[PDB]
């Protein structure tokens, strides 16, 4: 259940804008077997700003009826989206993903090369679109790595919408209240965007991004472990509530003006009341109503593959599949010693069925594959797994 958020203050500097080009992964939900129905995924992550174009291709032809996830972002404020389609692969039918973004000068194509504690978070993204109407407002709510609501200001009838089966039982006063909070926050974000543009002497002709996150973490007993509330402008920290839930950290002079305004208005006190009360209380409720899924950890299915590169070298890839929640640690060791330097780690990616996937790769002198073991830490495993190349 949401909280009404404060407005950034109107007012030095000209600002600064972070741009991040998308990381792209194309993969199937399950290990692909010709003739068996499956899902083809294109996961784009780590990008900023949020406008992006993603197509799935089948033998170079764009696939129609591709669906995608609701816009959300990671702790560094960068965005991620999953695009996916049901399909049946063959041995020569070809699939790929084509991505365009402001950071690219031509569309980028990557082919399908088949070779305890809990948290609640709400994420908000507002993006102005000068000359093209009001800002786009999208907000999603998560319990751990399970999305349970979305609000999109561009929907035909913008409303808080259920996205997990255990939230559907909430009554109409719940949907009414949270829809109202979203609609109000839409307008608050519009004012924040206006005030921020003024603070940095920025033109009304340019697009800017205002992101908000808040939420709470609880232990196994249900007590509040900590609360969060952070804001970002154009992809960088702007102001954040400190862990004491009583003071702010402001990134620059303009944010200090917001800090002084929110101190005078006792915003931190209102957020503390929410985080210690409503937030933890509803999270505890959701965990009980969704216990069959939210409180079941799925351990990873793991295996190691061998990929020869040269005579004197080869790549070992350690795979983890079908795990929930997304938090996982994969580490390669040589004679038990972590190979921090030479390991390649991809971003953890959704399979599309609530579970997640990840791999870790290390380059090895051929003939010495046996001195290397992969080391998997996950909440669903009583203690770490170790695997060797067999
Ligand atoms: Cl993250």
Numbering used by the authors: 323 to 333, 996 to 1099, 2001 to 2275
Quote the paper:
For elucidation of the crystal structures of HLA-B∗39:06 and B∗39:01, the peptide selected was NRVMLPKAA, which represents amino acids 320 to 328 of human NACHT, LRR, and PYD domains-containing protein 2 (NLRP2). Thus, to obtain the protein in quantities suitable for X-ray crystallography, HLA-B∗39:06 was produced in mammalian cells as a secreted single-chain peptide-MHC (sc-pMHC) in which the NRVMLPKAA peptide, human β2m, and the extracellular domain of the HLA-B∗39:06 heavy chain were joined with flexible linkers. To enhance protein stability, a substitution was made at position 84 of the MHC heavy chain (Y84C), which leads to the formation of a disulfide bond between Cys84 and an additional cysteine introduced at the second position of the linker connecting the peptide and β2m. Consistent with the finding that Arg at position two of the peptide is a preferred residue for HLA-B∗39:06, the structure revealed that the side chain of this anchor residue is located in the B pocket and makes polar contacts with B-pocket residues Ser24 and Glu45 of the B∗39:06 heavy chain. However, in our structure, Ala8 of NRVMLPKAA, and not Ala9, occupies the F pocket and forms polar and van der Waals contacts with F-pocket residues Ser77, Asn80, Trp95, Thr143, and Trp147, while Ala9 is solvent-exposed. Superposition of H2-Kb and HLA-B∗39:06 underscores the 8-mer peptides OVA-8 and VSV-8 overlay with the first eight amino acids of the NRVMLPKAA peptide with RMSDs of 0.95 Å and 0.84 Å, respectively, over the eight aligned Cα atoms. This analysis suggests that the covalently tethered 9-mer peptide NRVMLPKAA binds to HLA-B∗39:06 analogous to an 8mer, with Ala8 occupying the F pocket. Additionally, our HLA-B∗39:06 structure suggests that for 8-mer peptides presented by this HLA-B allotype, the residues that are solvent-exposed and likely available to participate in interactions with a cognate T cell receptor (TCR) are at positions four and seven (Met4 and Lys7). Consistent with this behavior, we found that Val3 of the peptide forms van der Waals contacts with multiple residues of the MHC heavy chain, in addition to a hydrogen bond with Tyr99.
HLA class I molecules consist of an allele-specific heavy chain that is associated noncovalently with β2-microglobulin (β2m) and a presented peptide. The α1 and α2 domains of the heavy chain form the peptide-binding groove, which is characterized by six pockets designated A-F. In general, two well-conserved primary anchor residues occupy the B and F pockets and are located at position two and the C terminus of the peptide, respectively. Upon identifying a peptide that binds to both HLA-B∗39:06 and B∗39:01, we determined the respective X-ray structures of the two allotypes presenting this peptide to 1.7 Å resolution.
